[PDB]
C-alpha cells in the first residue's frame, strides 16, 4: 500500500429525517425542507452583499 | 491494520452536549416588528441577522 | 399649488425579489408605495417609500 497512488473511493451520502404529520397543510411549511429564501439569488449572483 | 505496515486505519465514536442560551442573561431578549399592508402583504422585521 | 421645491422622485431597484427604496416629495407615502408596488405588479411589502 506504501507504493500505491491516491485513489479516491466513490462518495454516499445519506440523510435521514423526519417527514410531518400526514395532514399537515401544504401551506404550514414548518417541518418542510425549505430551501433559503435567497438561494435562487445567491446562486444568480443577484443577492446584494 | 494487521494487513497493512504504513497505512493505518481509526475509528471513533463521540457525543456531545451544547447549552442554549447567551450565558449573560440580559442578552435572552428579542424583539420584532411586523406590518400588513392593505394588500394583505406582509412584511416582517426582527432584531437577527 | 407653486411650492417652491417641484415634484421629484428618486427609485432605486435593489435587484432582488422586485424590491424598490424610493425617496419623495409626497405627503403619501402610502399611496406612493401601492400605485408603484401595482403598477410592476408586486406585494406592497416589496416597496419601501422615504
Not at chain 1, 454516499?12 to 401551506?27: D, T
Amino acid at each position: 500500500s506504501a507504493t500505491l497512488l491516491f485513489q479516491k473511493h466513490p462518495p454516499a451520502n445519506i440523510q435521514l429525517f423526519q417527514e410531518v404529520p400526514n395532514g399537515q397543510s401544504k401551506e404550514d411549511t414548518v417541518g418542510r425542507p425549505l430551501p433559503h429564501l435567497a438561494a435562487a439569488m445567491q446562486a444568480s449572483g443577484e443577492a446584494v452583499y | 491494520n494487521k494487513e497493512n505496515c504504513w497505512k493505518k486505519r481509526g475509528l471513533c465514536i463521540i457525543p456531545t452536549k451544547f447549552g442554549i442560551s447567551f450565558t449573560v442573561p440580559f442578552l435572552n431578549q428579542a424583539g420584532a416588528l411586523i406590518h400588513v399592508y392593505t394588500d394583505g402583504s406582509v412584511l416582517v422585521s426582527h432584531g437577527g441577522t | 399649488h407653486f411650492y417652491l421645491e417641484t415634484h421629484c422622485t428618486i427609485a432605486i431597484p435593489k435587484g432582488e425579489e422586485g424590491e424598490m427604496e424610493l425617496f419623495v416629495s409626497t405627503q403619501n407615502a402610502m399611496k406612493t408605495q401601492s400605485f408603484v408596488a401595482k403598477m410592476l405588479g408586486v406585494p406592497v411589502n416589496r416597496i419601501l417609500v422615504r
